[PDB]
Design a binder for this molecule. Sequence first.
Ligand SMILES: [Mg+2]
Length: 142
Amino acid sequence: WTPPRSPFNLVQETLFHDPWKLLIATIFLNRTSGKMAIPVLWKFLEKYPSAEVARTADWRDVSELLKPLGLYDLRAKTIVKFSDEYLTKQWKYPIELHGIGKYGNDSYRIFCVNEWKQVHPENHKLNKYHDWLWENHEKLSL
DNA sequence: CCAGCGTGCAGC
DNA sequence: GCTGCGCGCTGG
Ligand SMILES: [Mg+2]
């Protein structure tokens, strides 16, 4: 399953091969514009390339990097705990994990697994992608 | 200048 | 069902 590239350029389209990275991106996008969040995301992932590294980080350090995005202490703590659970808790869908709600879960189900036909998003950007998928999947041969 | 907002979520 | 978290951007 390869989710198609869309005219809406969701960052999920490029991150789907690594579900942890895609989920971290959703967290970075919580009430934060992609224009701001996505550049900080690459800096984050250079320092913390995997859940293994993030799980062991001090959230106060992560917070310093997240500062210009807002929600910096909240999300720093989320990222550490989410990363821990990702690796050590039994889960089938990531909504079961701390920090991931319907938006992150719907992202995972559209991009990381082939469940897009079952997903009913309530996030505007995801709905633009998901609507467009229904309208074009025949042409794309999905 | 400055009110509103951005691909939310947990805790309550 | 509501609230705290939160910055820089955005555009009048
Ligand atoms: Mg969750």
